[PDB]
Amino acid sequence: TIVVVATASESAALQYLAPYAGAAMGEYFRDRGEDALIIYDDLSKQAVAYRQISLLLRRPPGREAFPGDVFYLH
């Protein structure tokens, strides 16, 4: 099996997509009909990630400075 590489240094880009990044993979197996699982943690830096970004994006923050994208994200 393969695990992602995720570092503290990791550019927030990689960070924010990084699970969504992760998604495309197993679509191999499941889409291959092969079966798979994956770990999920609370990465949760993601919000200041995609979000602090959004500040850069000038974007309007949601609660806890974070928009409902979590839902969307989730």
């Binding site: 309007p60 949601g62 609660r63 928009p67 409902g68 839902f71 969307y72």
Partner: protein
């Protein structure tokens, strides 16, 4: 929306995601509700209300996906908004939000097309009669009345097998009446849905009613939009002069979607971040339901219960909005009873008084007392031995456990599991049986017969079986 030829272009002005800045001809533009579609690669795309902005450009949005943008961009403007092709064929047939026959397509031909944006007020219009809905529910209905076209609140939850309640409704609509209604889930775990489809096959009754379901896989613009759909759809049947009631999904999902919109709106949210106008939306919703002069629209809803904060502006709404109260109790069922519902804790201002009728309010009003007694009694016992208890206490205990037991009842739809044919309840019958029962009429009979039983005449027959 347009009677459509041409419908032009505009350009795509500024785009962040769903934020649609685009510009039409300098001359004119259709309403915010009015809408327009543009084939983007694979497909046409229509974005929601622009609100008002300049240069033929104004601000718009869509549930669909935004990838593959192009600066210059051209949308054929649809005009008479939202026209949608429902037909009675829909029942037992499922479509997408677009009416796209989402499932294995039933191919679903439809002669009706109408905007869901249709208002449905009229002053003095609906009948002045104030009819109650008659459920034949041994406790739900008997224990509490139901008004035609009335709004209904839901308490209960996971492990309630509410679908059991629903199926009960299925046998109840057809069985009770020709009138047939459909509800639709939105923002929901899919598995439940498909299982409920299978459960429709098992139910087999699915034909009478059908719906697109939101499942929460989707974008909000869709979601928030969905309401108007069902509005129009039943508006076929109440418009049919038919009359009906549909279940409803988590509102907080809905209104909250309101806020996500408002942030999307870039508009200042309401307090506690509600949709600054969210009340207005509720205006749409609650305002929608009516029992027409010629039709009846009732419904029930379960909204996401948020921490049970009564401070909830949403609870404010519900409490404000709600016309009726469901309660269901896993402890109560956890007595083992088929009826999970909270036997206590049921109120409908409708069901209440004299002028709601007295004697019903009599066997009823005292039935409350019985409730209280079983409270005190069932309560007090464990403390110590019951020897001290007055007989009246004891006798009460029997009429108590057995009155309780007496409630439990068979159901037709229940058959598939058990073959239980059940029956449609009867008010005169009910008031009869209970009233006498309350008197301890026929005090001799066995308690066991009473649980999951038939009529006092029929349970009386079980005394023969006994």
């Amino acid at each position: 929306h347009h009677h459509h030829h041409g419908m032009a272009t505009g350009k795509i002005v500024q785009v962040i995601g769903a934020v649609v800045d685009v510009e039409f001809p300098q001359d004119a533009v259709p309403r915010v509700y009015d809408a327009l579609e543009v084939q983007n690669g694979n497909e046409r795309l229509v974005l929601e209300v622009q609100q008002q902005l300049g240069g033929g450009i104004v601000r718009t949005i869509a549930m669909g996906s935004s990838d593959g943008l192009r600066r210059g961009l051209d949308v054929k403007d649809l005009e008479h908004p939202i026209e949608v092709p429902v037909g009675k064929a829909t029942l037992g047939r499922i479509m997408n939000v677009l009416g796209e026959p989402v499932d294995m397509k039933g191919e679903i031909g439809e002669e009706e097309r109408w905007a869901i944006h249709r208002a449905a007020p009229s002053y003095e219009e609906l009948s002045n009669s104030q009819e109650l809905l008659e459920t034949g529910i041994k406790v739900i209905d008997l224990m509490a009345p139901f008004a035609k076209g009335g709004k209904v609140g839901l308490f209960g939850g996971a492990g309630v097998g509410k679908t059991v309640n629903m199926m009960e409704l299925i046998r109840n609509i057809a069985i009770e009446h020709s009138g047939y209604s459909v509800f639709a889930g939105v923002g929901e775990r899919t598995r439940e849905g498909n299982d409920f489809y299978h459960e429709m096959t098992d139910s087999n009754v699915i034909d009478k009613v059908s719906l697109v379901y939101g499942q929460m896989n989707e974008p909000p613009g869709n979601r928030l939009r969905v309401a108007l759909t069902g509005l129009t759809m039943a508006e076929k049947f109440r418009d049919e002069g038919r009359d009906v009631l549909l279940f409803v999904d988590n509102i907080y999902r809905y209104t909250l979607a309101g806020t996500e919109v408002s942030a999307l709106l870039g508009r200042m949210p309401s307090a506690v971040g509600y949709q600054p106008t969210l009340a207005e939306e509720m205006g749409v919703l609650q305002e929608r339901i009516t029992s027409t002069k010629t039709g009846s629209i009732t419904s029930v809803q379960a909204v996401y219960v948020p921490a049970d904060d009564l401070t909830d502006p949403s609870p404010a709404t519900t409490f404000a909005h709600l016309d009726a109260t469901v309660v269901l109790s896993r402890q109560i069922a956890s007595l083992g009873i088929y009826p999970a519902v909270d036997p206590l804790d049921s109120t409908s201002r409708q069901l209440d008084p004299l002028v709601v009728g007295q004697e019903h309010y009599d066997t009823a009003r005292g039935v409350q007392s019985i409730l209280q007694r079983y409270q005190e009694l069932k309560d007090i016992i464990a403390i110590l031995g019951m020897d001290e208890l007055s007989e009246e206490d004891k006798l009460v205990v029997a009429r108590a456990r057995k009155i309780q037991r007496f409630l439990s009842q068979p159901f037709f739809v229940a058959e598939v599991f058990t073959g239980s044919p059940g029956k449609y309840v009867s008010l005169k019958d009910t008031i009869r049986g209970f009233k006498g029962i309350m008197e301890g009429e026929y005090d001799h009979l066995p308690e066991q017969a009473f649980y999951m039983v038939g009529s006092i005449e029929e349970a009386v027959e079980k005394a023969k079986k006994l």
